[PDB]
Design a protein around this ligand. Structure first.
Ligand code: CC7
Ligand code: CC7
Ligand code: CC7
Ligand code: CC7
Lengths: 201, 201, 201, 201
């Protein structure tokens, strides 16, 4: 309805922006496709909508929208549902396109990512490429060590990801501190295969 | 007028949101009813309205809207009206529905609640259920001990509540510090019946 | 133009708010008059307008709008115009109505006030009433001592005031620290007449 | 399209603002010209547009819009493109008019400036005037010493500048710390000609 119109009017706004800045045709179409995969023809002022509600209704909503994500990921599926709800209410949906570098190996990490749908490639100068996909997560190491990205991560397909910031990642682990051990265990496993080890875990 | 229209257009926005995320029929009606109890057919950009005013007019307004809350609650009714005004200007109105868990026993507390209208149930694994209702308040213990919720609290009816955040709760007790003793006294009483005691009070 | 319409539509929004909360007739008219003295039939999204500009244009604008305030107040009139400009760009315009208590004697101070037009009464339990008016300022003591209001201040007429917050008051005195001595001198004078003295000045 | 209309309606809003505050004719035209050089007939809610996108698309966009700035400025042109991208995503576009004092010699520095197009004059009481122009930058010293502006800087022509705040300047140099040495080297050179020296560099 008026969400279909909001999508349209917002995209025309994007169209005049690229017109104004004279971006090439291929870049414009790339932005067109992002816009279609990410919003799918409707646009919602989601912060304002859920802010009209209360905690229980918001929590009931995120749990419904993410049933598949929760169900297919053992970390969430077997955890205390209150831990899950706390994580879910802070996830932010993001779409990446084939070839995008989601994470660069040198940099500082400010967020981790949960793969709802898609394939990514884990890359280090000096090892092979492992694939991660639906039900998996990545970017957690830098969050735990407070260090620097131990690899680059690259979208292979269109990716529908849910991201979690370092602050919210930590606010949720102060609460429910048993769950940090669950993250470190897999992080230790993954480091041991990329020829790495680290005392901090 | 245009507040009746704002209610309508905002709710249709909510309607397309649940349509987009394919929520079941019972959940949609539950959200419909919340929306009717909480906004009652009109929607006001209340932050912007009261921000157009000045301190005295804002203070005169909250005191008028809350005469009954103040009058039926001894803590406010017999306190220094400036203490009351300071508390009132930071309360945030909230509606909960039957069955909602307002507070879960394990968690960290970030706010307390004043009952304008409604009945709630106080619940601990290992004690009976006490009811609280109009003129009463709850969630104050965690605010004082800076600890962890000593019980769960559950809406029995539709509840019209006014919430107060930990920060504002503390900003108002630094000012007017005699009023903290008033909170602790009742908190000590309530702990002594749920078989509990605590040195911090 | 569309600022006259914005005034109208915004006020009708206020009208439905008081209708919804059933405020009495005298309080509604009091709010009507405030709205007319404060906005004078036009409403401007002033943060957004001046944010479209740059520093020099903003500084040239506040200096023009406040020529009279600056010219009739020795503190500003003889100060370094850069000090003045720094103060001016942080002033916030406020209107008070006869009888309003602008400052209550017990409380914590978070701002001071510069009188563009109007008369106020300085009040302490145990002294006479001094009047301040156009070209004068007040609320500065608590800002300097970081203490507690040494008196109440009460609008006698409609007052057009410019307020300055404690933070901005301090950001401007770290810069230009010679000007704090100018404030303390008058504050020491005013304390000595209300039978008071204070070491911190 | 609707960006051309947004320019128009926004400018009429500015027009009623100056009408309301009765600004003289020359000042109004000065604001008219600023508005034309700065927005060029179109207005975009740029924060919201780029916020609809993702990191890679935003980074690809700033890099395209600033190809000339990057290419003509050795500091950026020969640096690690990730350093550049980090700087670019935090630049804020600004237009200054002939005669404006961009930086005053006494003051505290909160930002530096990169000259996309324009000529400025570097001024100290007690030295000659050096000109800087396209491809050059200034305001970096105060950012490095955390001190006080070592000179005034004055627009000679219309200037199209990109500014960088002290915080973002520092967030980017914690990352990529080799680039601070590049700034200090030129800062040391520039100080040595204005008869100055400083241990902190
Ligand atoms: N054998 C490995 C090693 C690392 N990784 C992920 O790559 C991420 C890159 O950034 P990070 O924040 O260091 O966390 C890393 C792992 O999730 C992985 O998925 N498999
Ligand atoms: N006998 C008792 C014990 C506790 N309570 C309230 O339950 C709240 C649960 O969270 P809280 O923040 O620990 O504060 C508690 C009391 O208000 C109560 O109302 N009666
Ligand atoms: N003789 C006096 C004493 C005090 N005052 C002002 O009253 C203000 C009340 O709050 P304040 O922040 O303590 O600063 C005080 C003086 O400006 C005044 O105007 N004349
Ligand atoms: N010989 C010099 C000396 C100083 N400058 C610039 O002037 C700026 C004024 O503020 P700043 O922040 O101290 O940084 C200074 C230099 O960029 C310059 O461009 N050439």
């Amino acid at each position: 309805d008026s969400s279909r119109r909001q999508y349209q009017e917002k995209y025309k706004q994007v169209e005049q922006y690229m017109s104004f800045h004279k971006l090439p045709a291929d870049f414009r179409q790339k932005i067109h496709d992002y816009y279609e995969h990410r919003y799918q023809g409707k646009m919602f002022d989601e912060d304002s909508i859920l802010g009209e509600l209360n905690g229980p209704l918001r929590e009931e909503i995120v749990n419904f929208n993410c049933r598949k994500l929760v169900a297919s990921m053992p970390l969430f599926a077997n955890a205390d549902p209150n831990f899950v709800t706390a994580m879910l209410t802070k996830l932010k949906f993001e779409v990446f396109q084939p070839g995008d570098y989601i994470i660069r190996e040198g940099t500082i990490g400010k967020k981790m990512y949960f793969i709802q749908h898609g394939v990514v490639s884990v890359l280090t100068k000096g090892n092979k490429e492992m694939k991660l996909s639906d039900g998996s997560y990545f970017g957690e190491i830098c969050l735990l060590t407070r260090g620097r990205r131990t690899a680059s991560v690259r979208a292979d397909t269109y990716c529908r990801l849910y991201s979690l910031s370092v602050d919210n990642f930590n606010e949720v682990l102060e609460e429910y501190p048993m769950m940090r051990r669950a993250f470190e265990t897999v992080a230790i496993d993954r480091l041991d295969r990329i020829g790495k080890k680290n005392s901090i875990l």
